[PDB]
Antibody, heavy 223, light 210 residues
């Protein structure tokens, strides 16, 4: 029953602030140290702070000593982390974790005993502004069942939703998670495998939809 | 950062030792070493705490020791659901926590779940619009760890590459994708480009040409 639930993924321009929350249930947040670590995608863990929710006392490494502001709202069993001056190296999953029991007579603050984790909160950094996608057909191999698809290139922000033949084709459809490019934009692709003899007779269309720029693209794919 | 071996590889039954090297101001000066286990999508999980003590729900497979400034996690009667990451951590004397760089482990007692790879060349409509994107779609692989390499002809290519981290497919296997950005002139002026996905020592390579 001890559970920590973090706020949803976020996105900030470089030079901007982010704030992440961490809701506790199954226990009283202020009875235990809260630790914050972080994990850049495909990188390792970096411990970033501990905070005593009763006193407000908070130690961070020299690295995070002026950028970070930990706070709590124990009325809500919520912990907060605020990180200033974001840059692309600030891009990672931020984890909160529950550490030792808080007591004046025994110090467990710096104990790395994290017996409970949040699921993590992805923060992305990008100087990118809304942008509609460019949709290109992915022609079936001409050799090839047959794989065909759609490339949904250089859009912002998420999500692009995708269907095929207005939903009349679902079997063998695989729409891939978007990659977050260094340019700051997203691309994704959606691929479907179809019987080879269906080419030339069955038309195929991917229905790309990007609400954030109010665009809809129904792209015809062909050999 | 505490120093770990970037990678260790093993086999069932037999044992593995993972190392952690710090300083007298952390690992040497306390019995506060903790070993964390983490799998591709999940959050880290506590195995060993305070050097050697067992966390709830952890086998004696895992044991913890310390030699002056070196922490070690010995693992015995090996299984296969490891296949992922081991991070070490120690209190410091500045009242902080320091983590090791992460032993990325690669056990072998499971079969696999080899990746289906699909490589698409730039579309005519894209080249026509003076860009080019090679798309490499990688699916159905388990365990969710992959390295992706691109080559133009026979030689490696590292610029213009964006590659996702592996994320769970709806089958309890994994997917990822990798994009190669090219100038239409680059694309035209090569025998071929290739996407090569490396999984568990094994490699799959898909190749396209203009």
């Amino acid at each position: 029953q001890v559970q920590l639930v973090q706020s949803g993924a976020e996105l900030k321009k470089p030079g901007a602030s982010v704030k992440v929350s961490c809701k506790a249930s199954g226990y009283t947040l202020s009875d235990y140290y809260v630790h914050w670590l972080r994990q850049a995608p495909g990188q390792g863990l970096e411990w970033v702070a501990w905070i005593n929710p009763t006193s407000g006392r908070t130690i961070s490494p020299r690295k995070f000593q002026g950028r970070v502001t930990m706070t709590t709202d124990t009325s809500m069993n919520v912990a907060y982390m605020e990180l200033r001056g974001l840059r692309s190296d600030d891009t990672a999953v931020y984890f909160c974790a529950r550490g030792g029991w808080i007591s004046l007579y025994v110090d467990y603050s710096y104990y790395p005993n994290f017996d409970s984790w949040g699921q993590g909160t992805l923060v992305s950094v990008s100087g990118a502004s809304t942008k509609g996608p460019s949709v290109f057909p992915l022609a079936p191999s001409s050799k090839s069942t047959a794989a065909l698809g759609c490339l949904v290139k250089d859009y912002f922000p998420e999500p692009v939703t995708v269907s095929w033949n207005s939903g009349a084709l679902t079997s063998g459809v695989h729409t891939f998670p978007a990659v977050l490019q260094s340019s700051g934009l997203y691309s994704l692709s959606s691929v479907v495998t179809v019987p080879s003899s269906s080419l030339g007779t069955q038309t195929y269309i991917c229905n790309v939809n990007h609400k954030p720029s109010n665009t809809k693209v129904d792209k015809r794919v062909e050999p | 950062v505490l120093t770990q071996p970037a990678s260790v590889s093993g086999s069932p039954g037999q044992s593995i030792t993972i190392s952690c090297t710090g300083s007298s101001s952390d690992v040497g000066s306390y019995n506060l070493v903790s070993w964390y286990q983490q799998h591709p999508g999940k959050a880290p999980k506590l195995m060993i705490y305070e050097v050697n003590k067992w966390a709830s729900g952890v086998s004696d497979r895992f044991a913890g020791s310390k030699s002056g400034n070196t922490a070690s996690l010995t693992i015995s009667r090996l299984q296969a659901e490891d296949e992922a990451n081991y991070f070490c951590s120690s209190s410091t004397n500045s009242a902080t926590v320091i983590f090791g760089g992460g032993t990325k482990l690669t056990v072998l007692g499971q079969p696999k779940g080899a990746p289906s790879v699909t490589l698409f060349p730039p579309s005519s409509e894209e080249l026509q619009a003076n860009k080019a994107t090679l798309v490499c779609l990688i699916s159905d692989f388990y365990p969710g760890a992959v390295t992706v390499a691109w080559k133009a002809d026979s030689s490696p290519v590292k610029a213009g590459v964006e590659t996702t981290t592996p994320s769970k497919q709806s089958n309890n296997k994994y997917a990822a994708s990798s994009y190669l950005s090219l100038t239409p002139e680059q694309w035209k002026s090569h025998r071929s480009y290739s996407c090569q996905v490396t999984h568990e020592g094994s490699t799959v390579e898909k190749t396209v040409a203009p």
